[PDB]
Curated annotation (Swiss-Prot), chain A:
Mode of membrane association: Lipid-anchor; GPI-anchor
Start and end residues of each LRRNT domain: 3-33
Species of provenance: Mus musculus (Mouse)
GO cellular component: axonal growth cone; cell surface; dendritic shaft; endoplasmic reticulum; external side of plasma membrane; glutamatergic synapse; growth cone; membrane raft
One Gene Ontology biological process: regulation of synapse assembly
Extent of the LRR repeats: 34-55, 58-79, 82-104, 107-128, 131-152, 155-176, 179-200, 203-224
GO molecular function per UniProt: chondroitin sulfate binding; ganglioside GM1 binding; ganglioside GT1b binding; heparin binding; neuregulin receptor activity
Family indicated by similarity: Belongs to the Nogo receptor family.
Disulfide-linked positions: 3-9, 7-19, 240-263, 242-302, 285-303
Entire protein: shown range: 27 to 337 of 473
Free-text function comment from the UniProt entry: Receptor for RTN4, OMG and MAG. Functions as a receptor for the sialylated gangliosides GT1b and GM1. Besides, functions as a receptor for chondroitin sulfate proteoglycans. Can also bind heparin. Intracellular signaling cascades are triggered via the coreceptor NGFR. Signaling mediates activation of Rho and downstream reorganization of the actin cytoskeleton. Mediates axonal growth inhibition. Mediates axonal growth inhibition and plays a role in regulating axon regeneration and neuronal plasticity in the adult central nervous system. Plays a role in postnatal brain development.
PTM annotation, UniProt: N-glycosylated. O-glycosylated. Contains terminal sialic acid groups on its glycan chains.
Lineage, top ranks: Eukaryota, Metazoa, Chordata, Craniata, Vertebrata
Full protein name: Reticulon-4 receptor
Main location: membrane
Location in or out of the cell: Cell membrane; Membrane raft; Cell projection, Dendrite; Cell projection, Axon
Length: 308, 317, 315, 313
């Protein structure tokens, strides 16, 4: 019954404790235990200690974005077995989340972790979140997409990873994401997508890969994407020589929608859209042609053969 | 001995035919060997259990356009050779007992349109594994519960237009793996659950026009691999970020579709979603709640929760 | 109506019951309470069951009509009885025939007693749609055949009683559909042969009675689908212990379950020997029905109708 | 820092051990890195959600032989690395909230015996796909609801003896396809549904002794293809017509079984059913001494089907 001074409390449609943008630097004491939704966003809260909301057993929505979170205790969400939506975004100094923090939240549907200065995704961080549908991880400081990071997320439909520093997509980065509809990887440092990286993405409808470091994309990697409707590939250093031939053909047959695929090399094809190129425009190796054998091994197969 | 108000003959099937004779009840003395009985266009109001009990070989029963107020739950129990049952155009019938069709394993067509039906009780279509045509249009249905058609694995046609169905839950159409044509137009459909059409891999025609769809998840169309024709006009489509998945689906789809006219935002009013470019679909156009012409920036976080996810993303950043 | 019929006793516990057995009733009594869940009319002298004889008793689950004087059952006798679970029509020896559509629509029927009803045949469609049926009693009738697909809808049937009839053989598809059958009683008939693959659908069968019949041989291959077999009775059959008995002999050696004795009727040298206890070398040559008649003097038509090993013999 | 009543050490696993210290509450200050906690033999009465919340890596929790009156539904929610949970010998616990074990997808053993349990609530064992050992013996259970163990695809041992289970319904043991050992002795089991053991194809050992079975359908034993040892003694077996299916099964079964002593009729008292001949099983021995001929058709409805046949002849 006693509502905290910084807060407004009401009962319909859900029991709500709302205290946003009140300059709070700590979670207010005396939050009604029957709260189903708690809005603490836009304050200056620095920490989330253990069991900060433990009495609110019926909590389904916890809003904590745009604070000054520097640390979240691994036991911060004790008691919140029914939590469905958790927004922790826009806390640029958070940097790290203990890998066990979200454990046991089997009702979680939405998790906002964007703009949290996250340096890495720890092992087990998203384990057990079988009901999760939306995962926001964009605009962090991620430098890797480790294998099996999303392995338990069989119900995930939306995965937002744009605006990090992801250098590549390993084979099993997206293992287990059989329900994924939308995958956004634009504005990273992706220089390559491993073969079979999209093996589990039979339901994917939308894939953004623009503003990355791709010089090539084997058509074979796109072949599991049988539900694909929309593909974005612009602003990549595409090399339109022999290595572009598979992607070129795939683009000709694909009935969905796609962006331009502008050539960056060779110079004679600069600013040409690959989709509009004739097959005979794709010749030789672009990369100076005589190289070290170790460097020759690092080039596409058609370049190694073009030397011969 | 043929009833006075009737005409009886034996080929091609034993038939008792007495339509539009102003009959106040089912006539007595219908030949027990009857296979086809045409009693439509009369003034019959009840069908007790004993009415057709002697007609063991009955396969076709026509009772449409009568004055049916009631059908006994045991009216057809022993008549399991029944193949076609037309009970339509009896507007005051209002309700059919959920056990009325149990055991009719040879039934192929069931007409229940224009019967003022208020609801489909649990188990109404249970066990009808041979049913091919089901007419339920122009009734007073206000709900399409999960598993209503669970056993209709052989149904090819399902008519549901002209009711007041407000939404399609996830398992409303579970089990309909033979369905070819599904007509849901002229209802109040405001939303379709993303996996509502999971079993409709053979569906060729789908009507959803004249409803209340502000958006349709492209995900719900994805299982419709046999789809050839899709009707979507006369819905209040919102052509903002929420329309992006459907927009892409419409570009790739090789079958035929109606226009998808944008209702909001105003700058895109009467534009066709099919003809829009991706860049046209940016941001959020608030089409729900009180204070109806409103900017997303003016909405609390709590208010944003009722909007599409992509609207929430647009408002915050 | 709600008052109890004169010849009856009515009570509510445990189920609403109308009980009028052995009252000398010649017809179904009027005024049986519509709320009846159970009706006992056995041991009277009821001569027929006309259309809708109990149609108001919508909650009826048990209808007892055995040991009456039924000469006819109207095809629509059981109108209204959608919830009927146990129907006992047994011991009406002058009934002779049931209209093939009489039980149609009785989807809750679990038990059906039709034994000792003088039944001359099982009409096409007689047991159609009885998906819940578990017990079917057909013993001590006058059945002269088991037509194909007679039981094809009886997927939940566990007990089938057919003894004391005049069934002459078991055709290939007689028992199609009986995937749940546990006990099959076929004794005291005239079974001269069991068609190969006749037991194809009886993988759950635990008990098979074939004694007091006219079997001269049983291919071991016909028993092979019976993976659940526990008990097999085969006595009182004119078993012929020649070359034709070799497969059954081998089967009996390996069989881990229980079986009766299998007494040899021919040849005379092995008369009344138990096939189970014979050595394989005791099984030789071919003994035709018949002084023993040689294969050598037989017609080719007759020869073709003998077991394969007999045809091979003397050839 | 190790709590005064405890001993703490690192190898082989980080362990906090404080058993039999007369503790009335879970000690505060248990090291967060604890993988194993031994608090058995104390007098602990409550387990609030906060108790073990900081022990994120907790794998083994021993709480047996305490005074538990209550376990909070959120007591283990975040501790999803739990593999062994021993809550046994807390006779006043009586109820475990149906959500208590949700999300424990690494749980391998769960001890709930001697907890005075009155019921198993819906969803109590939901999602425990890793569970191998489940102890539920010596409680106060009066029913085994359908689908109680539906998700326990990896369960090998299930102990249910010493309860008051009156019957086994058709789908009580649905889902238990890895089950090796099932102990149901010392209950009140009067009947087992014919298809109750449908999913128990790997079952090797079945204890049904000290119950109230007057008969057991052979049909229920048929799917038990791996069965090796069956205990059936100390039941009031009726060796009349209703025993014929079990009689035959007993003749064919090549694993081991206890004696199956007849309780009725008097002429076969204390005889082993396994040793009887088929001719010894005839007619109906009515539980009362009442003749079969004297029985009304109404009364016969509550008897085995073969008794109805033996009565009417
Ligand atoms: C949660 O909701 C339930 C059901 O309305 C209620 O009984 C319970 O008291 C609530 N819990 C809290 C902590 O308010
Ligand atoms: C995932 O979504 C499906 C519906 O698509 C739902 O039935 C299921 O309960 C959800 N959760 C899990 C763990 O499958
Ligand atoms: C990736 O591309 C950016 C331009 O968008 C460039 O500045 C950067 O050096 C590239 N990095 C690598 C590793 O190629
Ligand atoms: C129904 O059809 C069967 C077979 O054609 C026939 O024997 C019977 O007389 C017909 N009529 C009735 C009322 O059963
Ligand atoms: C469905 O229809 C086909 C022919 O259209 C038929 O062969 C099949 O038996 C029907 N299925 C059922 C379950 O009756
Ligand atoms: C649906 O739209 C029609 C016209 O477009 C309107 O008359 C009706 O009120 C709407 N229904 C709902 C529930 O908003
Ligand atoms: C059958 O039982 C139902 C519910 O017990 C009752 O409402 C109904 O009146 C009964 N029918 C008759 C004919 O008594
Ligand atoms: C047949 O038996 C199965 C197994 O007990 C049961 O689930 C099913 O409901 C039964 N069928 C009918 C029609 O009663
Ligand atoms: C059937 O067996 C009996 C044995 O009592 C025998 O009398 C009868 O002739 C046999 N029937 C045939 C057709 O051989
Ligand atoms: C759990 O173990 C990991 C190492 O696997 C360690 O980094 C972490 O600090 C441990 N957690 C606690 C609360 O001790
Ligand atoms: C079940 O057991 C198998 C074999 O021991 C194992 O591979 C599997 O991981 C187990 N399941 C779980 C959920 O641990
Ligand atoms: C079996 O039931 C009887 C009374 O019905 C009871 O005395 C006996 O203790 C029961 N058996 C067991 C093992 O509890
Ligand atoms: Cl609440
Ligand atoms: Cl804010
Ligand atoms: Cl903290
Ligand atoms: Cl959500
Ligand atoms: Cl993104
Ligand atoms: Cl999408
Ligand atoms: Cl390729
Ligand atoms: Cl792009
Ligand atoms: Cl170009
Ligand atoms: Cl290449
Ligand atoms: Cl070359
Ligand atoms: Cl008309
Ligand atoms: Cl009128
Ligand atoms: Cl009526
Ligand atoms: Cl329609
Ligand atoms: Cl069509
Ligand atoms: Cl979608
Ligand atoms: Cl349209
Ligand atoms: Cl149009
Ligand atoms: Cl506008
Ligand atoms: Cl347009
Ligand atoms: Cl964003
Ligand atoms: Cl009698
Ligand atoms: Cl009659
Ligand atoms: Cl029999
Ligand atoms: Cl049996
Ligand atoms: Cl034959
Ligand atoms: Cl053979
Ligand atoms: Cl025998
Ligand atoms: Cl001889
Ligand atoms: Cl001998
Ligand atoms: Cl042969
Ligand atoms: Cl140590
Ligand atoms: Cl102890
Ligand atoms: Cl351990
Ligand atoms: Cl023990
Ligand atoms: Cl035990
Ligand atoms: Cl049995
Ligand atoms: Cl024992
Ligand atoms: Cl065995
Ligand atoms: Cl066995
Ligand atoms: Cl003995
Ligand atoms: Cl008894
Ligand atoms: Cl009696
Ligand atoms: Cl029995
Ligand atoms: Cl008998």
């Amino acid at each position: 019954s006693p509502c905290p001074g910084a807060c407004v409390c009401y009962n319909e449609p859900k029991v709500t404790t709302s205290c946003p943008q009140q300059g709070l630097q700590a979670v207010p004491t005396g939050i009604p235990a029957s709260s189903q939704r708690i809005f603490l966003h836009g304050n200056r809260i620095s920490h989330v200690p253990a069991a900060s909301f433990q009495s609110c057993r019926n909590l389904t929505i916890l809003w904590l974005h745009s604070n000054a979170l520097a640390r979240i205790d691994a036991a911060a969400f004790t008691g919140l077995t029914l939590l469905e939506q958790l927004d922790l975004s826009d806390n640029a100094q958070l940097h790290v989340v203990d890998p066990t923090t979200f454990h046991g939240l089997g009702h979680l549907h939405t998790l906002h972790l964007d703009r949290c200065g996250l340096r890495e995704l720890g092992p087990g961080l998203f384990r057990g979140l079988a009901a999760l549908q939306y995962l926001y991880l964009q605009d962090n400081n991620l430098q890797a997409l480790p294998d099996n990071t999303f392995r338990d997320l069989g119900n995930l439909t939306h995965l937002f990873l744009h605006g990090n520093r992801i250098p590549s997509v390993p084979e099993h980065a997206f293992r287990g994401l059989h329900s994924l509809d939308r995958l956004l990887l634009h504005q990273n440092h992706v220089a390559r997508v491993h073969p079979h990286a999209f093996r589990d993405l039979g339901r994917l409808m939308t894939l953004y890969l623009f503003a990355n470091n791709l010089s090539m994309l084997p058509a074979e990697v796109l072949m599991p994407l049988r539900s694909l409707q929309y593909l974005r590939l612009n602003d990549n250093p595409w090399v339109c020589d022999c290595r572009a031939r598979p992607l070129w053909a795939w683009l000709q047959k694909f009935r969905g929608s796609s962006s331009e695929v502008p050539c960056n090399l060779p110079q004679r094809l600069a600013d040409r859209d690959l989709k509009r190129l004739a097959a005979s425009d794709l010749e030789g190796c672009a990369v100076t042609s005589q190289l070290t054998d170790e460097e020759l091994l690092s080039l596409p197969k058609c370049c190694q053969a073009a030397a011969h």
